Design an enzyme around this catalytic site. Structure first.
Site, short mmCIF file in Angstrom:
data_model
loop_
_atom_site.label_atom_id
_atom_site.label_comp_id
_atom_site.label_asym_id
_atom_site.label_seq_id
_atom_site.Cartn_x
_atom_site.Cartn_y
_atom_site.Cartn_z
N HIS A 25 8.23 18.41 -8.17
CA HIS A 25 9.78 18.68 -9.09
C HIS A 25 9.32 19.77 -10.16
O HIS A 25 10.16 20.55 -10.49
CB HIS A 25 10.21 17.38 -9.64
CG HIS A 25 11.54 17.56 -10.39
ND1 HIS A 25 11.95 16.53 -11.18
CD2 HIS A 25 12.51 18.52 -10.35
CE1 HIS A 25 12.93 16.88 -11.78
NE2 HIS A 25 13.57 18.05 -11.18
N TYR B 257 16.95 -0.19 -10.65
CA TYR B 257 17.78 1.01 -10.14
C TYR B 257 18.37 0.78 -8.66
O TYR B 257 17.94 1.27 -7.97
CB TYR B 257 16.38 1.92 -9.96
CG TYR B 257 15.78 2.53 -11.09
CD1 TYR B 257 16.50 2.81 -12.17
CD2 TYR B 257 14.40 1.94 -11.47
CE1 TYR B 257 15.87 3.50 -13.22
CE2 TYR B 257 14.03 2.32 -12.62
CZ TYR B 257 14.52 3.10 -13.56
OH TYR B 257 13.98 3.20 -14.75
N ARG B 258 19.41 0.19 -8.91
CA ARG B 258 20.15 -0.47 -7.65
C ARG B 258 20.89 0.93 -7.03
O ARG B 258 21.19 0.82 -5.72
CB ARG B 258 21.20 -1.56 -7.99
CG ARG B 258 20.67 -2.63 -8.13
CD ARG B 258 21.53 -3.90 -8.52
NE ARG B 258 22.68 -3.97 -7.51
CZ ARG B 258 24.05 -3.68 -8.05
NH1 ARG B 258 24.35 -3.45 -9.34
NH2 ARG B 258 24.87 -4.03 -7.10
N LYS C 224 15.47 -3.52 -8.67
CA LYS C 224 16.58 -4.39 -9.24
C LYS C 224 17.11 -3.73 -10.44
O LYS C 224 18.13 -3.71 -10.88
CB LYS C 224 16.08 -5.92 -9.54
CG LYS C 224 15.79 -6.93 -8.56
CD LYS C 224 15.61 -8.22 -8.96
CE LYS C 224 15.02 -8.71 -7.51
NZ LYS C 224 14.39 -10.26 -7.59
N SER D 165 5.97 14.70 -16.86
CA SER D 165 6.03 14.64 -15.30
C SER D 165 4.92 15.60 -14.87
O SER D 165 4.39 16.47 -15.67
CB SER D 165 7.30 15.27 -14.86
OG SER D 165 7.45 16.43 -15.03
N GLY D 166 4.38 14.91 -13.82
CA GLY D 166 2.99 15.73 -13.15
C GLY D 166 1.90 15.16 -13.60
O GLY D 166 0.76 15.44 -12.85
N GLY E 290 8.56 16.28 -20.23
CA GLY E 290 7.32 16.96 -20.62
C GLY E 290 6.20 16.01 -20.13
O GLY E 290 5.14 16.91 -20.09
N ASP F 136 7.31 13.12 -4.40
CA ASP F 136 7.06 13.83 -5.57
C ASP F 136 5.77 14.40 -5.79
O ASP F 136 5.05 13.58 -6.58
CB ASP F 136 7.93 13.50 -6.88
CG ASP F 136 8.07 14.37 -7.75
OD1 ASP F 136 7.73 15.59 -7.78
OD2 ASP F 136 8.47 13.98 -9.06
#
Ligand SMILES: COC1=C(c2cc(Cl)ccc2C#N)CC(=O)N([C@@H](C[C@@H]2CCCCO2)C(=O)Nc2ccc(C(=O)O)cc2)C1
Length: 236
Positions: A44, A162-163, A160, A188-189, A186, A93
């Site tokens: 991403h 994140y339906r 549950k 991420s990765g 900031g 990702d």
């Protein structure tokens, strides 16, 4: 990182900060050293990045304010994005950066192992998320690398919460029931690093959440063990 504490020099020597150079020079993403010319990060991160020419990898950084005109960095020779990546929340990702030269390992810059062959059913209880990201959803990049210990949650619990999303076996989630510590914008990765038998392993790559540190909303990470064959193929 929400609810974290300052790291010290040498504490997380596989952590890097990936900067873009245009139109300004700034932190884009975290990443992890996994070999002498290899950074593992999130696909991403490269949304709208026209080529590797505008990237710099800085290793051995504690404070972003250390980065000046004379600070050494690695150029990026190649960006390898997983062929199936489309969107963070849809998985895949994961990306590799091949550096233009080899990293000399020191107390401040060293690789982290991948999850080991034979450890597929290890229960990791000592997992840490690190980065220069926001301290809450509305914030700014932090100067000093932060750390937070976060418990893994099962995929069944994660699904549950994140339906509206497909939480797959290629993802791993981590968070507290009542929130308060998490990755944020900031981070991420960067790594989710877990210590097992006094060895650190790169269990996750910080990927996405719908917020930061909310109750019953664990962070979602790329499940590195499910990509070991891909990583080994790409790195030789
Ligand atoms: C949507 O969830 C994301 C993160 C996240 C992860 C977990 Cl585990 C748990 C919760 C969250 C959350 N919120 C963490 C994460 O860093 N991203 C990223 C997503 C972006 C997309 C474009 C390319 C860079 O990355 C991001 O918000 N990065 C970013 C944002 C602002 C700045 C800045 O002000 O300079 C720099 C970097 C998003």
């Amino acid at each position: 990182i929400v609810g974290g504490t300052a790291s010290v020099r040498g504490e997380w020597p596989w952590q890097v900060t990936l900067h873009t150079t245009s139109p300004t020079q700034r932190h884009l993403c975290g990443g992890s050293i996994i070999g002498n010319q290899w950074i593992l990060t999130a696909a991403h991160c490269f949304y709208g990045v026209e080529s590797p020419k505008i990237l710099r990898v800085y290793s051995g950084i504690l404070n972003q304010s250390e980065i000046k005109e004379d600070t050494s960095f690695f150029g990026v020779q190649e960006i390898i994005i997983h062929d199936q990546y489309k969107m963070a929340e849809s998985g895949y990702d994961i990306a590799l950066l091949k550096l233009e030269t080899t990293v000399n390992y020191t107390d401040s810059q060293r690789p982290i192992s991948l999850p080991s062959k034979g450890d597929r059913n290890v229960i990791y209880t000592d997992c840490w998320v690190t980065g220069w990201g926001y301290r809450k959803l509305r914030d700014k990049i932090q100067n000093t690398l932060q750390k937070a210990k976060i418990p893994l949650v099962t995929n069944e619990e994660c699904q549950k919460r994140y339906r509206g999303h497909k939480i797959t076996h290629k993802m791993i989630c981590a968070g507290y029931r009542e929130g308060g510590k998490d990755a944020c914008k900031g981070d991420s990765g960067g790594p989710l690093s877990c210590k097992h038998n006094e060895v650190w392993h790169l269990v996750g790559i910080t990927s996405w959440g719908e917020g930061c540190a909310q109750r019953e909303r664990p962070g979602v990470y790329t499940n590195v063990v499910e990509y070991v064959d891909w990583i080994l193929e790409k790195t030789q």
